[PDB]
A = this chain, B = another copy of it.
Amino acid sequence: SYNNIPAGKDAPNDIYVIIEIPANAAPIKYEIDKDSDALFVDRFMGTAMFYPANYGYVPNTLSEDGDPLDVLVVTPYPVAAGSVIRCRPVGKLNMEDDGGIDAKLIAVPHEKLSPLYKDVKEYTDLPQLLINQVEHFFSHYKDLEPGKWVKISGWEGADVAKAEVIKAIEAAK
């Protein structure tokens, strides 16, 4: 089951992300049901938007919102919903919403999976337009869900994102 997957083979530098929503997919928000391991349809998204990168969580972590830590994973082609990507954080996007504050990490595939991201050490090494798309997506994807808003605060770098992984790991135990 998904519970058997460690937060990573090697901590913050070498982590696993279980993908719930593929990049470039239909506007269906899935979420792994923790009791059953099944992919639940959580929402048919209102806005006509798509996730600019694969979206999921690091197993065996806990964030402030009671869910595991959220991560976007950039890949050369979208991966299957429910599949698991070995990856490496390169940044952290901070935001405020209607329920306080939120954050999403961004990660790239481990070099065992692809050579394409060898030179991507910080989120600023990704295409500037991709970074803008991610900011714009999280700023607006809930605009048609009543009582929901999101304001983008700003980014922090790979080191701070990796620190967030470690904090979420300890928080889960």
Q: Which residues of A contact B (CB under 8 A)?
A: 1-2, 4-5, 18, 24, 26-28, 30, 33, 35-44, 46-52, 75-86, 109, 112-116, 127-129, 132-133, 136-137, 140, 143-144
**Inter-subunit contact A4/B35 (CB<8 Å):** yes
CA distance A76 to B53 in the complex (A): 13
**Inter-subunit contact A36/B116 (CB<8 Å):** no
**Inter-subunit contact A36/B1 (CB<8 Å):** yes
- The residue that A27 contacts in the complex, of B43, B77, B81, B109, with Cβ under 8 A, is B77
CB closest chain-B residue, reference A27: B77
**Inter-subunit contact A41/B109 (CB<8 Å):** yes
**Inter-subunit contact A5/B38 (CB<8 Å):** yes
CA distance A39 to B26 in the complex (A): 21
Q: How far is the CB of A150 from chain B (nearest CB, A)?
A: 13
**Inter-subunit contact A4/B133 (CB<8 Å):** no
Given A77-B26, A116-B127, A132-B144, A109:B40 Cβ within 8 A: no
Residues of B within 8 A of A49 (CB): 47-50
**Inter-subunit contact A41/B77 (CB<8 Å):** no
CA distance A76 to B24 in the complex (A): 12
**Inter-subunit contact B5/A41 (CB<8 Å):** no
Residues of B within 8 A of A132 (CB): 46, 144
Residues of B within 8 A of A38 (CB): 2, 5, 18, 82-84
29 A-B contacts (beta carbon < 8 Å): A1-B36, A4-B35, A4-B36, A5-B36, A26-B78, A28-B77, A28-B79, A33-B84, A38-B82, A38-B83, A39-B80, A39-B82, A39-B84, A41-B79, A44-B109, A44-B116, A46-B115, A46-B129, A47-B49, A47-B137, A48-B52, A48-B137, A49-B50, A80-B82, A114-B129, A116-B129, A136-B144, A140-B140, A140-B143
